[PDB]
Design a protein around this ligand. Structure first.
Ligand code: NAP
Ligand code: NAP
Ligand code: O77
Lengths: 425, 425
């Protein structure tokens, strides 16, 4: 079945998954999280008798439950060969470090490894990093299937899920993989439809953040908010000047979707209809704003129409059109997610929030991979250089000695080269 | 050059105009307001010593002043022939009525008649009703040049100008007409730029409400709010579902602009660039939402681009992007102007607000006029039909005995025919 399940990285995602895993019945449930303040707080909470707790918000409160953890490790040396399934709940830009850091000499019994938020090439990269003869199947879930946050870092085991996707996709490094069906069931428990696809890259090409975060949060407006310490953070999904969404950002979104689509075709995977994907799998609007015919025909509609429809879609979501109206006729301000900004870590060094550091690193790797398929991806590269220039000016102003080295530019070509070699086996 | 000036319709517009007239320099100032409760209060206020009182709000505090009314009539037949200039400050739907009611055969001293909110064809309609040989020049202003309101019907001659337009247009029935220059200076005193055009219809075709109110407030969503009794009233300039703006309504806007522009051309008037007119004459947005080259090139853009640009324009104006940002990074909610709705009058009868009643009437005339130039105007007719069917069902439900006669069907063909006859003269 799933056997004993080890969660790697015990954050908001891991707690949602733990709930769904305990509904399905796992056998033993463990977690490994690298040493640090969070791990320390987790161990204290578990030692005081706490359990993982998940709160569903609003119409999701039916999801609420508690789940028990059998073992927690903040030290890989105590791991023994007790685990059949590994679930990576760490940031996706850390998958390589995490897979290299795992004690595989002690994990020979692992037969499945699930990437909960994969990107194009993640399955191949993880496999290139496995030890020789490893025969764990690697599974790529397209995106994390919910929106979950740890409310209060002082209660590190309590998370709140505010939203749930209608549907996600799941590929496997092993053809016709039986494990996909198990995960379909596991996630069905929280209301999500899991669509199995014949290839990990087909699933990885349906990672929603690659298509949305890249054009919106790697641009000038977003980085200016993110790299700022004074003034209001702005809003991530509002129109200029309150947020980053402009016709030019929408054009970037269209042009990058075309590039990513061509890469997926060159790796043997069917691209997606971006508008139907956003509307049908993530969050819809009314037929008056987006006609069903326009959604289904998006890929054939021509660039100007395509960009008009994407803009309408994001404008139509500035509020939640299905939320209840207030006394005055207003709907919930769905678009007001403030931007998280740079902050100083415990060593005094400036650090970047995961938006956009994670989005930058995923795209840099996808671009470097695409060069092996002779694909230049100029729109992706333009968004990379926009991020690089903004961060470089922030180091200039702030001083290098003040900045965590994750702010410096990272070389994606070794990883791309390992991905491509793995692909050509 | 203005001589003695008779203001016809002593309401908010007239008070503002009176003060602008006095700043420039005029003769005696008279007013003609037809009988009614308002004229009764005016008469008492005048008997108690009242003046015309203008107050400018905030920025415009410098507009404030008082002006004496030298004469007040309610009965057109009591007018003496001591008037060189007439200014029609009544609703435009009453221009024909007013001109037909005046004893022109003993008003041979009138040299100028100014229509303050002239619709397409208004100049020609007014001239239609003048006696042969009448030598008065008819001037057409594209629209009233401020936003003005009598605060309290208790102090009937005290008005509040809360804002002043950027620019209006003025055309004259007399080619290269002198009095045009005089009125340009008079209104410039308020801060508006007045642009003389070569014919009356060139100016009449630059009324913004014809192009915006028609598609937005004659549609199904706006009428459902306007005819609504209970529930929140909604917002005139927000997107569906909080307001009437949808891709479909923007399509209506583009198509109606096409139809109006062809009518103007057949009438000898150069039409306008809708996008340029909205941005430069009404409220601008930043270059990143609407590039100047896109604004200037709008007429030549192609229908899909044009519709996208129009939608961007209204979406960009959901908040005032030039308003100061608050602590949270939000701008002023410029789009939350609630719909005014039907209400019972003095006699208990349901009345429609000026929006959309005056807009329906203006558009009905334009469509009837256009038929004489062999122009079907199907978009305009679809909007008229939507209004008529909605208002017709409201009468069905409430009962005609409960509805004011202004809600009943109208036939604008007799006025259309006279405009056309005068135009062919
Ligand atoms: N949360 C969401 O709703 C959401 C939405 C979309 C996508 N995602 C995806 O899911 C990922 C996880 O989100 P999350 O919210 O669960 O994150 P999170 O709460 O920050 O948790 C990640 C966990 O992994 C550990 N971790 C972080 N960085 C690591 C590294 N370099 N090496 C090893 N362990 C590390 C963390 O511990 P420390 O804090 O101690 O490092 C923490 O326990 C996101 O990064 C993204 O890829 C999540
Ligand atoms: N005020 C603005 O800011 C503004 C802005 C844009 C457009 N406009 C346009 O300009 C027009 C005038 O506006 P307003 O605000 O001044 O309206 P108002 O306050 O209604 O004033 C109209 C005045 O004319 C009188 N009147 C109406 N019909 C008449 C007739 N046939 N003969 C003589 N007097 C008559 C009214 O008397 P009763 O009340 O007794 O009928 C009233 O005193 C409006 O229709 C409006 O669409 C005004
Ligand atoms: N949040 C997602 C990215 C997709 N966001 C949604 C829009 C949205 C979310 N909240 C307010 N608007 C979208 O673009 O369709 C993720 O990170 O996976």
């Amino acid at each position: 079945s799933l056997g004993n399940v080890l969660l790697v990285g015990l954050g908001a995602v891991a707690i949602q998954v733990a709930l769904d895993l305990r509904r399905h019945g796992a056998g033993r449930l463990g977690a490994l999280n690298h040493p640090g303040r969070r791990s320390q707080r987790i161990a204290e909470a578990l030692a005081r008798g706490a359990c993982l707790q998940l709160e569903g918000q609003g119409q999701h409160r039916w999801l609420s439950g508690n789940a028990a953890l059998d073992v927690f490790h903040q030290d890989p040396a105590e791991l023994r060969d007790d685990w059949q399934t590994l679930v990576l709940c760490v940031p996706a830009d850390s998958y390589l470090d995490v897979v290299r850091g795992l004690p595989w000499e002690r994990l020979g019994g692992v037969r499945t490894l699930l990437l909960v938020s994969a990107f194009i090439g993640a399955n191949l990269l993880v496999r290139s990093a496995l030890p020789a003869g490893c025969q764990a199947t690697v599974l790529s879930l397209s995106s994390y299937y919910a929106a979950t946050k740890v409310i209060d870092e002082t209660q590190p085991l309590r998370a709140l899920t505010k939203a749930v996707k209608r549907r996600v996709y799941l590929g496997s490094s092993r053809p016709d993989c039986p494990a996909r069906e198990t995960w379909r069931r596991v996630l069905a428990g929280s209301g999500v439809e899991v669509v199995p696809l014949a290839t990990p890259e087909a699933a990885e090409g349906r990672n929603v953040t690659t298509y949305v975060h890249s054009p919106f949060f790697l641009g000038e407006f977003a980085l200016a908010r993110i790299l700022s310490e004074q003034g209001p953070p702005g809003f991530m999904y509002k129109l200029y000047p309150e947020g980053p969404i402009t016709p030019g950002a929408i054009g970037a979104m269209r042009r990058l979707w075309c590039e990513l689509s061509e890469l997926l075709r060159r790796m043997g995977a069917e691209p997606l209809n971006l508008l139907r994907f956003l509307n049908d799998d993530n969050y819809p609007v009314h037929e008056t704003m987006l006609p069903r015919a326009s959604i289904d025909g998006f890929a054939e509609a021509g660039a100007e129409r395509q960009e008009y429809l994407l803009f309408v879609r994001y404008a139509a979501l500035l509020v939640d059109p299905f939320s209840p109206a207030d006394e005055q006729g207003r709907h919930f301000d769905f678009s007001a997610v403030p931007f998280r900004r740079v902050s100083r870590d415990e060593d005094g060094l400036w650090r970047l929030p995961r938006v956009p550091l994670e989005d930058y690193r995923k795209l840099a790797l996808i671009v470097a991979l695409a060069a092996h398929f002779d694909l230049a991806m100029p729109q992706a590269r333009s968004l990379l250089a926009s991020y690089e220039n903004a961060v470089s000016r922030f180091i200039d102003c702030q001083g290098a000695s003040q900045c965590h080295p994750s702010l410096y530019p990272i070389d994606s070509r070794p990883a791309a080269d390992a991905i491509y070699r793995q692909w050509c086996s």
